[PDB]
């Protein structure tokens, strides 16, 4: 089963809760050391110390991913611990609707946290999954890049160009052996609503961090060692 | 013939050569009153004053579409001149193949150029064209929001980005009466060549004059009832 990654360094952002801690820690049962950090040290290091005690290899950080300051400590962070980078989940983000009327301070900000630090974060791994034979990025969208909503201006326009950037370094990062794709979740569970948004959710289920985790797994593994540029919508089936 | 742009005033940037001065003179012809915007107050001056010789309205003004001071300059002289907005063609940007290495800097002046300026600009024309009784947006885009190549690593992720601001702010304006729609163009006529044709099965590149008729349509009430909405004018193929 190339579904181990078992020979790996794994850079997790965001993976104090949620979908990067479910990463952080199956990871971390494949085989992987990871790097879990966080805006949060304490939440970080929680999840590290609970990877280490399940077994596995595991350090904590905080990184604001829009620091470069945090993003250069992350990076020679897993260099000095671990020798070298080989997968890098970009989990870290956030952002949501803000009316179109906003502030422009708002919709920089938007593009700052969704995509210029994983573009850069990014940039400063490719060179070390180089010598360490490729390695394999994965950032986590939403399914507000492919849909069109109201108070979207903002966290739409930076998922979408999250995955046209995953598409198009796919080319540029390619020849160093490094494949980009991408994750797009939907509904997760961290109520007649609730139902009423099942309704168009074809499986008649929300989905576990598990799920993403699962498919993060997926795409990072060498099981996926042909696949890259590639937007994966995890969505049981629907919007 | 609903093709017309009678009672309209479209302010139209980068306007003095290719693209923008075409749609300039193509909308002038229509009807509208132009406010012709450029970087270089020379080029936007002669545009419009051949537009006032061939027996339009038009206006010239210098205009870096990132500098919010030329913005408010351009929507006030929009206002003074015709007393409305009912036309933003943002067909200012640019930008092009940079390394995947390359400086964060870079990156991010193609989303203040290719992005930030055009949502500002939407931005400030919508009240004026919610006041007027609406109008039409038209985002230059280009057809690197679509494709997938090396070194495109900005400039596709800004022109993607445009593509679903498009999509999505359709929504937010929608309500006052205004379209948002964009054009992506392929190869502009200004054994590579034969590359090119050997991909547009037309075989033939496209005047300026293409993309002027596609935005005159587009920002037209012919199109009353077409919004969020990216048309890709390459003759069929990609260059």
């Known amino acids: 089963s190339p579904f181990h990654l078992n020979d790996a360094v794994a850079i997790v952002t965001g993976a104090a809760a949620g979908i990067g801690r479910a990463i952080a820690g199956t990871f971390a049962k494949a085989g992987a050391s ?44 897993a260099l000095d611990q671990f020798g070298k980078i080989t997968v890098l989940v970009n989990n870290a983000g956030g952002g949501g609707p803000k009316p179109f009327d906003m502030p422009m301070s708002d919709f920089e900000w938007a593009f700052k946290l969704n995509l210029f630090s994983l573009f850069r974060l990014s940039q400063l791994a490719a060179p070390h999954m180089q010598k360490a034979g490729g390695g394999a990025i994965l950032n986590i969208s939403s399914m507000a890049g492919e849909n069109t909503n109201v108070r979207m201006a903002s966290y739409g326009s930076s998922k979408a160009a999250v995955n046209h950037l995953t598409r198009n370094i796919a080319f540029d990062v390619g020849p160093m052996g490094i494949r980009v794709n991408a994750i797009a979740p939907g509904a997760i569970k961290t109520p007649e609503i609730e139902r009423a948004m099942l309704k168009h959710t074809p499986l008649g289920r929300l989905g576990e961090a598990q799920d993403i985790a699962n498919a993060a797994l997926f795409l990072c593994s060498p099981a996926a060692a042909w696949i890259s540029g590639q937007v994966l919508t995890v969505s049981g089936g629907g919007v």
Do not use: F, M, P, Y
């Not at 966080?38 to 350090?59: M, P």
């Not at 905080?62 to 400590?73: G, I, K, L, S, Y």
């Open 34 to 77: 990871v790097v879990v950090t966080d805006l949060k040290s304490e939440g970080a290091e929680a999840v590290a110390a609970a990877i280490r005690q399940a077994g596995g290899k595991a350090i904590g950080l905080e990184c604001n991913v829009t620091d470069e300051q945090h993003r250069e400590a992350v990076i020679k962070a």
